[PDB]
Structure formats: C-alpha cells, structure tokens
Design a protein around this ligand. Structure first.
Ligand SMILES: O=C(Cc1ccc(O)cc1)Nc1ncc(-c2ccc(O)cc2)nc1Cc1ccccc1
Length: 301
C-alpha cells in the first residue's frame, strides 16, 4: 500500500488557521466510532493494516497530527505538546463524533489522547493504548535507558540529526520495526519530511517534550501527572494495554499500570512500532475489546 494510495482514501478538514488530513471509514455515519492516534515520527499510515480489523465494528478515524502526515505545517515551527493539542482538540470538534468514542493510541498520540480523555471524561467509551506515555519518567532504572540520547537530542546536535539527517525517520523508525519495510512503505513515512529543514521539526520537538522528572518541561509534566492520576482510578473506563514483546516502553508501561482498574493486557510481537510487525493481532485485540465493551459488564474489581 503506497503513500498516495493511503492518502487517496483520506479526508481534509480546516482546523483553526490550518488543516488536518485524516482517514474516515464512514463519514457522517453515527455509530460505534474509534479514533486512532499515531506518534513520532509516524502518521495515520501507521494504522493502515490495523483499521481493516476494526472497521466492521466501528467508524474509524485516524488523523495526521499537525505538521505530520498530510496535515498542514505551522509557519512558526512550534510543535510542542500544547501546540499539537490545540489542533487535535479542534479536530475532535470538527469530525461529527458521537457522544462517546473509543481512543486507540500510540506514543505521543497517547499523550494527546490520554489528555483529551482526561478533559472530556464523559465522552470516553474506552482506551486502547500501546507503547504509550502513561507517567513521568522518575528513574532511568524503570525505563529504557535513553537518558544520554535525550540529552544529545536536546543539544544543538539535535537540529543536525533531524532537520538535516532526518534521524527519526531514517534510523530510529526502521530500527524499532522487526521486519524490513518495503521501500514504498518507507517512502510513505519519508513523504511528509522529504524537504530538509523545518518540515522535520515535529520529529525533533517531540522527544524534546519527554516528561522527565527534573529534566522535562513542567507543562507536559503537569498534564501527564494529572491524566496518570485520573487513569489510575478510572474504574468506569474500560482499558486495553497492548503489550509489545519485547517492545521499547512496554516493560515500563507494564509496571506503571499495575494498579490501574479495569485494564486488560494483551501481548503481541513487536518493538516500538508494533503495528508494523503484528497489525492483524493488534487489530483482532481491538475488535475483541470493542465486542466486550457492548456488553457493558459490571466489574467487581
Ligand atoms: O518521547 C517519546 C514519547 C514517549 C513514548 C512512550 C513513553 O512511555 C514515553 C514517551 N519517544 C522517544 N523519544 C526519544 C527516543 C530516542 C531518541 C534518540 C535515540 O538515540 C533513541 C531513542 N525514542 C523514543 C521512543 C522510540 C521511538 C522509536 C524507536 C525507539 C524508541
């Protein structure tokens, strides 16, 4: 599936001063509805082999975050978490969502989705999350050891690595898929970032936002602390954690969420970009989760 083939099935809608591209399986159809949120450095294309398993059960939306995929670029090249939330938040209001939705999310898309859910709790049918931002990083012994890499990316070498050498696309992304991407799959991911310079800025700002205790930005830390607190006691919100084996953040997520009520776990084969190694098994687990939702079980503990 080429990039042009994927985006040919996608829509665009104005958002604030810009526009966002997005996949919509059933525009205008008020039914069971699932929103898929990608992360860094991917796009809605990441969900292309997952959505077909969910589409029979739900209208599927998968937006391109601002500055990414086929969505607009911001002329000031500010793509902090709050910048992204601004546009995603407005996007939610513009695609005719029913009263409650299910969020499926990955990486920084789970940061944005968790926060959106925290701020619209009455609209959350359920949350599927994987390789997700579930808490502030307080110890590098509980987490993958990227301390030195984050420091490196925060320095001036970050601009060279990403703006000029597109590090996240050309090295990080394929390093954390187990299979080898086809070269039309790789071009799909290169496509939004082919012009060197500031078009790649979103893939540099995103790791610069990572919520590290005593090193991460206070606004992202407060947002994460506050949706982590909410999720930790969200007994009324059904949740699926898709664990990637061996994964990247998966092991740290496994233990950060031990205490969370009403969360089931399913493990699949994968590193960070698990959707490219087990698309079908991720798709089936979502369909199972969605079939169980409709039973609206009254859980005891
Ligand atoms: O900052 C993030 C977002 C994030 C996701 C989950 C989570 O629990 C906390 C934060 N991710 C990130 N941020 C920075 C880096 C990173 C940067 C440089 C480097 O040499 C290695 C990893 N990696 C990553 C994730 C990643 C992506 C692809 C492959 C491996 C790992």
């Amino acid at each position: 599936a080429t990039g042009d083939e994927w985006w040919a099935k996608c829509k665009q809608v104005d958002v604030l001063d810009s526009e966002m591209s997005y996949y919509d399986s059933d525009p205008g159809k008020h039914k069971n509805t699932v929103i898929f949120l990608h992360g860094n450095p991917t796009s809605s294309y990441l969900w292309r082999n997952v959505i077909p398993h969910v589409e029979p059960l739900a209208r599927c939306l998968a937006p391109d975050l601002i500055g990414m995929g086929k969505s607009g670029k911001l002329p000031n090249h500010s793509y902090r978490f709050v910048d992204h939330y601004r546009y995603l938040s407005a996007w939610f209001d513009s695609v005719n969502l029913p009263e409650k939705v299910t969020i499926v999310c990955h990486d920084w898309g789970s940061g944005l989705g968790f926060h959106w859910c925290n701020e619209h709790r009455d609209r959350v049918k359920g949350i599927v999350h994987m390789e997700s931002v579930v808490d502030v990083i307080e110890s590098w012994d509980e987490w993958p050891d990227i301390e030195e890499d984050i420091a490196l990316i925060k320095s001036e070498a970050g601009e060279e690595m990403v703006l000029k050498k597109n590090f996240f696309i050309e090295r990080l992304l394929p390093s954390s898929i187990m299979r080898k991407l086809s070269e039309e799959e790789m071009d799909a991911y290169r496509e939004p970032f082919v012009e060197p310079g500031e078009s790649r800025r979103p893939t540099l700002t995103w790791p610069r936002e990572i919520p590290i205790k005593g090193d991460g930005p206070e606004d992202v830390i407060e947002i994460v602390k506050s949706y982590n607190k909410w999720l930790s006691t969200s007994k009324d919100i059904p949740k699926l954690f898709i664990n990637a084996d061996p994964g990247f953040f998966s092991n740290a997520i496994k233990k950060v969420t031990k205490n969370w009520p009403n969360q089931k776990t399913v493990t699949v084969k994968g590193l960070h970009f698990l959707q490219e190694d087990s698309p079908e098994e991720i798709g089936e687990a979502i369909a199972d989760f969605l079939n169980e939702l409709t039973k609206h079980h009254h859980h005891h503990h």
